[PDB]
Design a protein around this ligand. Structure first.
Ligand SMILES: CC(C)C[C@H](NC(=O)[C@H](CCc1ccccc1)NC(=O)CN1CCOCC1)C(=O)N[C@@H](Cc1ccccc1)C(=O)N[C@@H](CC(C)C)[C@@H](O)[C@H](C)CO
Lengths: 201, 213, 250, 199, 234, 238, 243, 217
């Protein structure tokens, strides 16, 4: 895996690869690792595939029920806290799962990192997965809060790309989403083979 | 001590066409270095529009099969309609994850038709992680089947080739070919190949023969 | 089964709980028991119904229970229910102590018992406890304190109050001789002697018939003491020497 | 790995913690806060296991606040400390033990300033000064060398600076910035973050 | 003379259930109309004081994006049922990745019918039936659908139905104006007309609430302005 | 009056009034008919409507591929019992991979429904059932009462004014065993229509049919699918 | 346990136990509350002044959280139960959700609790009604009212308890935009409304106010006597020079 | 059962024209010890089916008790329905898998033979719940020794007569007695036909030992 997300002036950028492995064997390269919880809430996905999918889906259910009950939309902090609380009750049982809850809140752009270990921290930028370090490199070397939209897109896409270059367990296609105040938008979905041609020559 | 698992072999394949869906599997049930039976297809007809392939540990295969049957019936009694293919996929996901801490040792591939009549494959992992595919292999010889279909159906690594959609005929011969090749290298794959074709007309069953060694 | 049920936790058409009121009627027949709050302490004074020539007297008291090193209580009604509630009170106090490592604030203890009584009024189908309680104590939050709790699970903090037989007249009599902010333990004892004198059906009042305890603050520690017969006799005699004195002016 | 430090003065309690939230080999947060306001005059510095820290700390916090709402007055720092110690000790031999080391800073209207130290085994001990984490091994001795019971808050802050600088010198972990707060008769006061202009 | 909550009358009915049916008759009257262009639900709010904020009176709620519900009688009882319905729909979405048919939801809620009793029961189990009546209006694969449910648990599909105090009269007035081909505007108009007839207070934009569920649009609660624009053509 | 309100109270005449009161619930619903040939089992149910704007109440329910039922009484209890039967059938298929013999399912219904008639605070099931099934003993029509008693029938009718239908069936029992499917459904429809005044008769809007047999799984015909059965019937007398 | 149906339907379709509980509420001390622009005020009448009783230990106004306060009318013990459970819930909400609590939410919780007690075996409806008051984030001041039945609504101003209809009518005829245009004027409105039913005093009235992002503030009898003096002055400077 | 004690070895099965035949020795072994040399490891489950069992004999006795009770329970009704061999096989599969999933297996490997509705049935059931149908079956060492012989014949001649199948079985039992160190020269043969289930008494296997005098040359 190799997901990453950072918040700047114009919302929250979210990006991921799509590779899924079963050992050294590449089981898939067409995995949607950015779960669409709500039209304003996204959840990245890294680690145990079934674990992430199931728990974030359940999170989506819970957020929907919250929306119906309280006649208002759930906050990013509340969603992340919900997921964290659900996951914590299974601590030590072997759930492998590291996700990012991103969205736009009444407090503006929101981004949280939530672990199967029990972590839950808000922050500006985050990178999760086997290739997270490689992404962290370029992302940190190119990040700014005053980044223009297309620039942020380039930064995220490139970071995930370099990550796929070094990390043997990351590849497939770079997917890119943008979270704005009126909801999120599916920015891009470029295959790595094409991005190679674009970035090298 | 005591192990509640035993690998029984078996290979499984599903291809999705524009108006069809193929679900095929070998018919060899084995254990250790021995053959249990040569007449054991891994294909299970769920509905007129949906066929399931289950490989791995035979106990969990049987159990999961019967469970899926029962729950199909339940859904039918509850909503007065048959389960759509994608619905069966989601249900299967939940059922598989329900044993997250004592998994069914089963590789599952669902092949059928969606609500628009088009073909669809859904590939699963033993604990419920699934996705929709045009074509996927699973089971012992999976790594032998996948790369060819990536080349021939996905047209990958081929320069200036035409993207002609897969016809039922070509798909059929492709299935027979990959299974025949797998029978050469995989020791768990052999005896016979059962193929299940799913169209608007219904479900056909064909049976090619594989080597017995 | 449904026939034998007396429906103890059910609203009456007027919007009231009959078993609670009947329990109040039970309390009205029990020995008179009052308490007064002062500036240098707080005291309890109760009529003794266990007054017979052949009784053995093997306890420090009869209607005065020690609950906590900073708290004591007196009781009126069914004595066994009183035993249950007092034991439970001690339990609660020791739990709070075990948890926070400091004495339980008086009001918290009272509310803690009252929640149980209320619970007995709302569900379970059991009869409520026919017991009213008076609580005296000291804590670092509100100093000296007097409380009263009824079987309804309801409670309140008082500067002086009474509970038991002839409680009403005793309350008005306390209203008359009250002294907000100017009360000392001695004058409070005088008041207690007076009220208990007029309210107790058997007049003259020997020290045999009453029971008085005081809670005071002395050198950092809290002292709870039950007065001996002699001291009570002193208070009574003084009351008569103040009653035969005011009657001279005629 | 996390670092806590507490220094009690005659009428105040000075507390400080690192601002690093790290996982694996990377710092994931440079502004992490390890302190929890429980009363208007009580701070809880919790550190340790992944989810155990926040879970336990927030549980204690909300229970203290519940006490405040139920009774109209706040728990004393001592009562608080023994409450947390009771909770932590009760879960010690249970199915769900909380692996947390903690400090409790407080000011009482009666007893004055107070600092408490708690093992993950829930052993509560009052101290003029304490520290948690590996960094403690490098700082405690310093605190032994220069601490006096009558130390002024300015001198206390300077001492804290000596400690943190020592961390910058000998400790192999990064730890560039530190949260610093003080507690007195006027409650909790946030101070300027002690930081070292590395990069 | 007191008896068990699961006692039968000599006529062959449960006393408590019948009494609940009697309880419905004291509730705010509501009307639901089914139309191939969508389903509409209207209900009077019965404001008992000018000081009472009318926007805090909701007798029409959203079960899901494709299903809305109107209620009459003891509303407090209805809240539980509503939440149960929402939870059921979300569970079904989680499990099967699809929306619930209106009939399935209605049936699911209807399963909590005679789930009451004394002996041989759970500590938190219901002691009495729900004194409320429900109209489920929604759009599924079978198009627009309207269902009715009463404390007996008997649920049935209706083309047009009125529940509440003015049940009979409003039902007659409904029978007089319903043909299985009305437009949604006609349905809303008729609903508000019959409502104005049966209501004791003057029908206005803050006196009632109206909501529609149509094949192309989600559950929509009519705002003040839209309500006015329909009341306009009285 | 003192033996009326509890199911655990015998009357001095050796009767249980709550059970009988529960039996009265069956007669409160719309009538239904069940009959069997030698190859087919058929349920014909008269659906009832509140107003003309309300759809007609479901009266025929699917249990298993070889078993269906027709209800008469409290729809909630009906749904309960139905779900029970469905569950038992599913269990039988899960365990033995063969369909549950109808008679055994009926026996289980008896056992289950008997329990609450003997416990304080409990109540009998306020519903009567007609069960049509097919197994390797042929077709079967069963009847279950709130009294937890069950009957194996050649033909039966339960509910409001079902006496007429009963009287009809009792004359054509001898014909039933040899009829083809269409004639069987015919007889069922005539029996059903006997329970109506001459001012009203059967319609595609108020008649449901359930059929199971050696050549057919249990199927339910409701609206336009009922017409091939109604169209082919006498004009009836007055 | 006690598996007995207590609250059941009557042949006319009534829940007698709930109605009885409402009658128990009717016997309670009058409790009123009004909602203003930047303030919200709750006042309770006949506090049963015995003058030998500590006023603090018998207050009918309780804070549930820093955000929400609440007054009640009816059985005081039941009210203690409900209040404590409400406080616990207010904390649990913070535990499961980072955000605090909305007035509507805690009101809904209390209402649901009461209803649950109207439909559960072996239990018995709470004999209280509650006036819940708060200033949830977004600044919007809100006041709600609950009922033993489980029903709950929002109000601009309301009253419960002994002679609640009288104070309801008074408030209906007196709630304007001119009134409650200033904080002191809203408080004066509450005091007047209370005086329109209380046994003519001021030492019988307990009034408390919540304002903006501040904490709950209870009014001392001195300040209450001051506002009552201004009210008795406005009743002789605008009602004496015209009548 | 986590540690099997007294056990029985191979169990053979094979279909023939109008019936099914099953074989199993009468030995219960306590490790390498031939402890109980006279026990039946074959049960008559009603008139249409029959069961042979390998593994822990006690667990087999348990299953024997349970199955016997089920058959009695059914026979009490007399409603004209009875357990088909396939049904019994399905039940047994369900049971073994259930015990497997409780991490408390019944240490048995079983062969169910049957004849109902004119069709011959032969089913295999594991202790893990692995079950299947086949024209020939062999458990334990049989699966390595007897089964290859059985398949050789059945792929050269699918349909066998009863005498042919019986001969095949006899020869297989001979091979097993030769090569299986935990077998015994005293076995039983059970047969299902339309006439019912018949278990033939203590049989012995003729043995050739001429290759004993081939040491030198
Ligand atoms: C079949 C594929 C498509 C999915 C794959 N599943 C699997 O690998 C399943 C999981 C079975 C299981 C049992 C018990 C408890 C948990 C899981 N295992 C198997 O299918 C069979 N194998 C047996 C021998 O070989 C290895 C696995 C998977 O989840 N892969 C993870 C890595 C992993 C995590 C935890 C356990 C096992 C594997 C993955 O791709 N993660 C990516 C993100 C997600 C959303 C796909 C990333 O982490 C990136 C790609 C790096 O791997």
């Amino acid at each position: 895996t190799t997901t990453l997300a950072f918040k700047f002036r114009h919302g929250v950028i979210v990006a991921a690869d799509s590779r899924a492995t079963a050992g050294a064997y590449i089981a898939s390269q067409t995995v949607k690792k950015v779960i669409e919880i709500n039209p304003y809430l996204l959840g990245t996905m890294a680690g145990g595939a079934a674990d992430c999918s199931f728990w974030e889906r359940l999170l989506a259910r819970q957020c929907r029920i919250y929306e119906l009950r309280n006649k208002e939309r759930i906050s990013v902090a509340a969603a992340s806290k919900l997921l964290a609380n659900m996951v914590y009750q299974y601590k030590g049982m072997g759930l492998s799962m590291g996700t990012m809850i991103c969205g736009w809140d009444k407090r503006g752009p929101g981004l949280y990192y939530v672990d199967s270990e029990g972590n839950r921290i808000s922050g500006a930028t985050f990178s999760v997965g086997s290739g997270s370090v490689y992404a962290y490199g370029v992302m940190d070397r190119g990040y700014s809060y005053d980044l223009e939209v297309e620039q942020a897109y380039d930064l995220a896409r490139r970071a995930i790309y370099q990550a796929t270059y070094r990390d043997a367990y990351s590849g497939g296609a770079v997917n890119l989403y943008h979270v704005r105040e009126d909801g999120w938008i599916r920015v891009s979905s470029d295959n790595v083979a094409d991005l190679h041609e674009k970035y090298s020559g | 001590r005591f192990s509640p698992y035993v690998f029984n072999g078996g290979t499984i394949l599903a291809i999705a066409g524009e108006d069809f869906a193929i679900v095929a599997s070998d018919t060899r049930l084995s254990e250790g270095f021995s053959i249990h039976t040569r007449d054991s297809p891994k294909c299970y007809k769920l509905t007129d529009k949906t066929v399931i392939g289950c490989s791995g540990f035979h106990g969990d295969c049987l159990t999961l099969t019967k469970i899926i049957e029962a729950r199909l019936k339940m859904y039918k009694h509850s909503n007065n309609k048959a389960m759509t293919t994608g619905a069966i996929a989601a249900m299967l996901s939940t059922i598989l994850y329900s044993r997250r801490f004592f998994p069914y040792y089963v590789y599952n591939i669902i092949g059928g038709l969606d609500e628009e009549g088009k073909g669809a494959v859904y590939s699963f992992d033993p604990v419920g992680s699934y996705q929709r595919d045009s074509f996927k292999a699973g089971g012992s010889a999976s790594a032998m089947l996948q790369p060819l279909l990536d080349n021939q159906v996905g047209f990958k690594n081929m320069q200036n080739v035409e993207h002609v959609p897969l016809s039922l005929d070509r798909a059929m011969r492709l299935v027979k070919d990959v299974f025949i090749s797998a029978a050469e290298r995989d020791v768990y794959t052999g005896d016979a190949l059962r193929i299940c074709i799913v169209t608007k007309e219904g479900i056909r069953e064909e049976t090619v023969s594989l080597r017995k060694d | 089964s449904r026939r034998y049920d007396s429906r103890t936790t059910i609203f009456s058409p007027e919007g009231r709980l009959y078993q609670v009121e009947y329990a109040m009627e039970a309390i009205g027949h029990a020995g008179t028991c009052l308490g007064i709050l002062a500036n240098d302490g707080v005291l309890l004074a109760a009529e003794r119904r266990n007054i017979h020539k052949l009784l053995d007297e093997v306890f420090f008291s009869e209607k005065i229970y020690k609950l906590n090193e900073d708290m004591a209580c007196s009781v009126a009604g069914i004595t066994s229910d009183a035993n249950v509630l007092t034991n439970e009170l001690r339990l609660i106090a020791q739990r709070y102590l075990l948890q926070y490592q400091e004495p339980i604030p008086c009001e918290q203890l009272v509310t803690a018992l009252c929640d149980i009584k209320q619970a007995y009024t709302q569900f379970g189908g059991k009869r409520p406890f026919g017991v009213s309680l008076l609580y005296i104590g000291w804590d670092k939050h509100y100093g000296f304190q007097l409380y009263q709790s009824d079987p309804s699970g309801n409670y309140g903090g008082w500067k002086a109050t009474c509970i038991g037989n002839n409680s009403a007249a005793a309350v008005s009599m306390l209203k008359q001789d009250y002294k907000e902010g100017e009360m000392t333990l001695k004058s409070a004892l005088a008041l207690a002697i007076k009220v208990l004198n007029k309210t107790m059906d058997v007049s003259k009042l020997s020290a045999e018939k009453v029971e008085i305890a005081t809670l005071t603050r002395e050198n950092g520690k809290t002292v709870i003491r039950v007065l001996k017969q002699k001291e009570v006799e002193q208070l009574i005699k003084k009351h008569e020497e103040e009653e035969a004195k005011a009657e001279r002016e005629k | 790995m996390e670092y806590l430090i507490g220094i009690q003065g005659p009428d105040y309690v000075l507390v400080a913690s690192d601002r690093v939230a790290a996982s694996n080999i990377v710092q994931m947060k440079d502004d992490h806060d390890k302190m929890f306001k429980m009363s208007e005059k009580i701070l809880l510095l919790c550190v340790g296991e992944a989810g155990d820290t926040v879970q336990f700390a927030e549980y204690i916090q909300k229970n203290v606040q519940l006490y405040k709402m139920r009774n109209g007055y706040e728990l004393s720092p001592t009562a608080a400390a023994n409450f947390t110690r009771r909770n932590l000790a009760d879960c010690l031999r249970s199915r769900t033990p909380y692996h947390v080391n903690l400090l409790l800073a407080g000011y009482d209207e009666h007893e004055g300033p107070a600092l408490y130290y708690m093992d993950y085994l829930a052993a509560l001990a009052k101290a003029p000064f304490a520290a948690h984490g590996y960094g403690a091994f490098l700082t405690l001795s310093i605190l032994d060398r220069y601490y006096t019971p009558t130390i002024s808050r300015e001198r206390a802050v300077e001492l804290l600076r000596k400690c943190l600088e020592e961390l910058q010198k000998r400790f192999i972990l990064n730890l560039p910035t530190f949260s610093v707060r003080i507690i007195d008769k006027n409650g909790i006061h946030d101070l300027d973050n002690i930081s070292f202009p590395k990069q | 003379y007191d008896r068990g909550v699961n006692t039968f009358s000599p006529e062959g009915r449960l006393f408590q259930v019948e009494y609940a049916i009697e309880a419905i008759k004291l509730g705010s009257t509501a009307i639901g109309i089914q139309t191939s262009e969508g389903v509409c639900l209207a209900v009077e709010k019965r404001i008992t004081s000018p000081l009472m904020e009318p926007s805090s009176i909701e007798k029409i709620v959203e079960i899901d994006a494709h299903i809305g519900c109107a209620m009459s009688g003891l509303i407090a009882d209805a809240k539980t049922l509503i939440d149960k319905a929402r939870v059921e729909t979300q569970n079904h979405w989680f499990t099967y990745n699809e929306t619930m048919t209106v009939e399935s939801v209605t049936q699911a809620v209807s399963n909590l019918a005679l789930q009451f009793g004394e002996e041989d029961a759970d500590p938190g189990a219901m002691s009495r039936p729900f004194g409320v009546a429900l109209l489920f209006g929604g759009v599924d694969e079978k198009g627009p659908q309207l269902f009715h449910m009463d404390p007996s648990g008997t649920f049935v599909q209706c083309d047009a139905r009125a529940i509440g105090s003015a049940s009979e009269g409003a039902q007659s007035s409904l029978q007089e104006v319903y043909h299985k081909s009305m437009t949604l505007k006609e349905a809303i108009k008729s609903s508000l007309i019959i409502l104005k007839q049966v209501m004791e207070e003057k029908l206005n934009a803050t006196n009632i609430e109206l909501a529609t569920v149509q094949p192309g649009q989600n559950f929509h609660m009519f705002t003040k302005e839209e309500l006015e624009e329909v009341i306009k053509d009285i | 009056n003192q033996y009326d309100n509890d199911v655990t109270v015998w009357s001095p005449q050796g009767r249980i009034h709550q059970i009988e009161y529960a039996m009265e619930a069956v007669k409160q619903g719309s009538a239904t008919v069940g009959l069997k040939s030698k190859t087919h089992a058929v349920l014909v149910a008269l659906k009832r409507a509140q107003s003309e704007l309300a759809a007609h109440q479901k009266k025929i329910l699917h249990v298993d591929n070889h078993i269906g039922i027709s209800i008469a009484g409290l729809t909630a209890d009906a749904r309960l019992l139905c779900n029970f039967m469905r569950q038992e059938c599913l269990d039988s298929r899960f365990v033995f991979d063969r369909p549950l013999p109808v008679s055994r399912l009926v026996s289980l219904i008896g056992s289950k429904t008997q329990i609450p008639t003997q416990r304080y605070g409990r109540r009998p099931y306020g519903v009567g059932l007609l069960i049509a099934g097919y197994d390797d003993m042929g077709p079967h029509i069963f009847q279950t009462c709130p009294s937890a008693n069950y009957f194996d029938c050649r033909a039966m009718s339960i509910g409001a004014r079902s006496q007429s239908a009963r009287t009809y069936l009792e004359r054509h029992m001898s014909e039933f065993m040899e009829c083809n499917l269409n004639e069987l459904v015919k007889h069922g429809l005539r029996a059903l229509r006997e329970t109506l005044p001459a001012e009203q008769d059967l319609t595609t809007k108020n008649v449901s049919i359930g059929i199971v047999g050696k050549d057919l799984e249990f199927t339910i015909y409701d609206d336009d699918d009922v017409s091939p059965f109604l169209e082919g019937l006498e004009e009836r007398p007055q | 346990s006690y598996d007995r149906a207590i609250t059941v339907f009557s042949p006319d379709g009534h829940l007698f136990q709930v109605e009885y509980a409402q009658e128990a509420v009717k016997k309670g001390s009058t409790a009123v509350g009004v909602r203003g622009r930047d303030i919200v005020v709750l006042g309770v009448e006949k506090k049963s002044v015995a003058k030998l009783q500590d006023e603090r230990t018998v207050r009918k106004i309780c804070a549930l959280d820093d955000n929400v306060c609440m007054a009640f009318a009816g059985l005081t013990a039941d009210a203690r139960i409900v209040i404590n459970r409400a406080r616990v819930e207010c904390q649990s909400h913070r535990l499961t959700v980072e955000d605090p609590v909305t007035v509507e939410y805690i009101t809904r919780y209390i209402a649901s609790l009461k209803q649950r007690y109207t439909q559960s075996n072996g239990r018995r409806p709470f004999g209280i009604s509650a006036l819940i008051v708060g200033f949830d984030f977004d600044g919007t001041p809100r006041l709600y009212q609950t009922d033993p039945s489980g029903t709950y609504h929002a109000w601009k101003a309301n009253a419960i308890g002994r002679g609640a209809k009288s104070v309801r009518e008074f408030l209906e005829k007196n709630y304007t935009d001119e009134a409650i245009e200033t904080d002191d004027l809203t408080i004066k409105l509450v005091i007047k409304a209370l005086l329109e039913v209380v046994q003519s005093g001021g030492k019988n009235i307990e009034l408390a106010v919540m304002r903006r992002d501040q904490s709950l503030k209870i009014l001392n009898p001195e300040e209450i006597e001051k506002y009552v003096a201004e009210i008795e002055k406005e009743k002789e400077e605008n009602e004496k020079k015209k009548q | 059962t986590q540690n099997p004690m007294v056990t029985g070895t191979s169990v053979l099965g094979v279909k023939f024209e109008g019936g099914v035949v099953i074989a199993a020795d009468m030995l219960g072994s306590y490790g390498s010890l031939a402890r109980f040399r006279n026990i039946s490891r074959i049960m008559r489950v009603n008139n249409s089916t029959m069961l042979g069992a390998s593994g822990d004999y006690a667990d087999f006795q348990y299953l024997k008790q349970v199955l016997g009770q089920m058959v009695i329970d059914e026979e009490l009704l007399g409603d004209g329905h009875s357990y088909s061999p396939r049904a019994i096989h399905s039940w047994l599969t369900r049971a073994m898998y259930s015990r497997r999933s409780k991490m408390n297996p019944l240490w048995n490997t079983m062969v169910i033979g049957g004849y109902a509705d004119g069709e011959s049935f032969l089913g295999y059931v594991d202790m893990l719940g692995v079950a299947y149908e086949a024209p020939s079956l062999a458990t334990g060492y049989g699966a390595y020794l007897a089964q290859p012989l059985l398949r050789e014949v059945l792929e050269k001649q699918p349909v066998l007569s009863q005498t042919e199948a019986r001969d095949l079985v006899e020869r297989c039992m001979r091979v097993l007695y030769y090569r299986d160190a935990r077998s015994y020269n005293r076995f039983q043969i059970a047969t299902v036909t339309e006439k019912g289930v018949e278990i033939e008494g203590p049989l012995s296997t003729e043995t050739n030992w001429d290759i004993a005098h081939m040491i030198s040359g």
